[PDB]
């Protein structure tokens, strides 16, 4: 069982340190349950974001093995191109030998330039991995480096230490109540079916059910723009001169919970959770069309309240209230 500590950056990004190569070269990476590739910047990249982050040098690693395979990835915000290579990745105390990963050759745009992390370590299914690159957790399981084919995530609140990805384990000191299990509706993301979203007993969005993904790599709780607009109006959030969804901090003590029903079980978010003396909404409209329908994203606003188990043996997500 391996523990990967995560730094809680402003309650907005959660990244941990990994080592790549022999001797290890260290990188910070977002542990991203919304994607499946591992990549870091490399000495082959001249983009600005490469210049202001740690760059992998395969020349200095005695265990590196080159490939002729290229890689390209476009995220919601940010993108990269590069080349795949193999090396040993130290992650959570585990020596992940023979791990394929991306060495960036371009990283355009300001988001990656201003972000504190060097790269991204995806934790989702192989079906959405660019170039069919084996995801880290698949390679761990393939090599028997974890005995149980699952991992769990605790994300801390209030910029506190203690966030972790627990590779191969579930730890009940991080939660209370019973874990409830949700089948993965479509294997790619950690995608699940939401039944309803309610406030003070009435349905405010997702009437008749909708699709959602559980994504540590997204800060906010996002949904289709039209639905989110209603929710913003429902909680009293107004966009201001600067493009921020502003809300009176006094509503934190006024407003009722917003309740997500998932597989028939109610998961409340208190206004303490879905309102971030500058208070803004934890919701954001973002349209993610798929053959499944538009996706909602249960990002860190949600995951901070629910210890989450990602079970690849079973293709299920487990949820329980954080301790
Ligand atoms: C780069 C990540 C650390 C951040 N992203 C979260 C990530 O989970 C998204 C979450 C996501 C998912 C779907 C649509 C938009 C965003 N996944 C994603 O874009 O996956 C990509 C992998 O290759 C492609 O195939 C799947 C989608 C692409 S992100 O949505 O782009 C993002 C970027 C900036 C901020 N501030 C907040 C979120």
UniProtKB/Swiss-Prot annotation:
Catalytic activity, EC: 3.4.23.1
The keyword Protease belongs to this UniProt entry's keyword annotation: yes
Regarding how it is modified after translation, the entry says:
Minor amounts of the active enzyme occur with 'Ala-58' at the amino end.
Tell me the GO BP annotations in alphabetical order.
digestion; proteolysis
Keywords of the record, alphabetical order, are: Aspartyl protease, Digestion, Disulfide bond, Hydrolase, Phosphoprotein, Protease, Secreted, Signal, Zymogen
The residues responsible for catalysis, as annotated, are: 32, 215
According to the UniProt record, which cysteines are disulfide-bonded? 45-50, 206-210, 249-279
| Catalytic activity, reaction form | Preferential cleavage: hydrophobic, preferably aromatic, residues in P1 and P1' positions. Cleaves 1-Phe-|-Val-2, 4-Gln-|-His-5, 13-Glu-|-Ala-14, 14-Ala-|-Leu-15, 15-Leu-|-Tyr-16, 16-Tyr-|-Leu-17, 23-Gly-|-Phe-24, 24-Phe-|-Phe-25 and 25-Phe-|-Tyr-26 bonds in the B chain of insulin
Described function: Shows particularly broad specificity; although bonds involving phenylalanine and leucine are preferred, many others are also cleaved to some extent.
What name has this protein been given in UniProt?
Answer: Pepsin A
Q: What is the lineage of its organism?
A: Eukaryota, Metazoa, Chordata, Craniata, Vertebrata
Shown portion of the complete protein runs from 60 to 385 of 385
């Amino acid at each position: 069982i391996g523990d990967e500590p995560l730094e809680n950056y402003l309650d907005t990004e959660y990244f941990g340190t990994i080592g790549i190569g022999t001797p290890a070269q260290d990188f910070t990476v977002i542990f991203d349950t919304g994607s499946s590739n591992l990549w870091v910047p490399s000495v082959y990249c001249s983009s600005l974001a490469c210049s202001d982050h740690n760059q992998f040098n395969p020349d200095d690693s005695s265990t590196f093995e080159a490939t002729s395979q290229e890689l390209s990835i476009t995220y919601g915000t940010g993108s990269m191109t590069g080349i795949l290579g193999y090396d040993t990745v130290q992650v959570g105390g585990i020596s992940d030998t023979n791990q394929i990963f991306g060495l960036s050759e371009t990283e355009p745009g300001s988001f990656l330039y201003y972000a504190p992390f060097d790269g991204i370590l995806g934790l989702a299914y192989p079906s959405i991995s660019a170039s069919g690159a084996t995801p880290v957790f698949d390679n761990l399981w393939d090599q028997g480096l974890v005995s149980q084919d699952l991992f769990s995530v605790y994300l801390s609140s209030n910029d506190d230490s203690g966030s972790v990805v627990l590779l191969g384990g579930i730890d009940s000191s991080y939660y209370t109540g019973s874990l409830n299990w949700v089948p993965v509706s479509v294997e790619g993301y950690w995608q699940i079916t939401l039944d309803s979203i309610t406030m003070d007993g009435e349905t405010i969005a997702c009437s008749g059910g909708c699709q959602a993904i559980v994504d540590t790599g997204t800060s906010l709780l996002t949904g289709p723009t039209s639905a989110i607009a209603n929710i913003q109006s429902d909680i009293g959030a107004s966009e201001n001169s600067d493009g921020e969804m502003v809300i009176s901090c006094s509503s934190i003590d006024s407003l009722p919970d917003i309740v997500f029903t998932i597989n028939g079980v109610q998961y409340p978010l208190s206004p303490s959770a879905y309102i971030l003396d500058s208070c803004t909404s934890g919701f954001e409209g973002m349209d993610v069309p798929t053959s499944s329908g538009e996706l909602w994203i249960l990002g860190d606003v949600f995951i901070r309240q629910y210890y989450t188990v990602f079970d690849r043996a079973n293709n299920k997500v487990g949820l329980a209230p954080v301790a």
